[PDB]
Amino acid sequence: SATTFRILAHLDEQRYPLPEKNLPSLFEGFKATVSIIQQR
Amino acid sequence: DFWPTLKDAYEPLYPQQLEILRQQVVSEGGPTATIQSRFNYAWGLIKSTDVNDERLGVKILTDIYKEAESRRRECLYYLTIGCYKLGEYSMAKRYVDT
Numbered sequence: 001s002a003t004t005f006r007i008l009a010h011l012d013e014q015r016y017p018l019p020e021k022n023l024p025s026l027f028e029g030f031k032a033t034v035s036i037i038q039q040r
Numbered sequence: 041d042f043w044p045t046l047k048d049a050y051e052p053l054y055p056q057q058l059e060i061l062r063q064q065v066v067s068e069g070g071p072t073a074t075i076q077s078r079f080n081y082a083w084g085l086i087k088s089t090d091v092n093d094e095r096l097g098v099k100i101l102t103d104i105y106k107e108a109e110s111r112r113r114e115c116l117y118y119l120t121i122g123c124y125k126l127g128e129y130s131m132a133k134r135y136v137d138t
Binding site for chain 2: 005010011016018019020
């Protein structure tokens with residue numbers, strides 16, 4: 001089902017609140033890695 | 041703040057490329073692998089056309105969000121795109137609000 005997805009991916013926003021200007025995004029690394037995969 | 045667009049999230053990778061990202065994850069310890077490698081796999085999964093891959097990709101991103109306080113902001117954005125793709129608009133609304 002999707003009820004199982006909803007359980008496993010549930011996010012208590014109060015429990016895990018938001019709180020750095022020198023931290024490369026995770027997406028930047030994705031894009032570089034997919035580029036190098038194209039050769040291998 | 042180099043973030044993904046809707047456009048990127050809707051183009052899948054080849055099965056063997058996704059498998060490489062998967063293999064890298066397993067290599068480093070699965071759920072205990074590095075944040076970068078888990079993300080790379082989660083995004084590839086979100087890009088997949090298979091709703092269940094997309095759900096797993098979103099689950100892994102949630103795990104990143106939980107574990108890494110320094111990644112929460114950007115992950116909320118990634119989470120919004122992935123939930124959108126899945127038709128999970130109530131989640132996507134709530135996240136992009138925060």
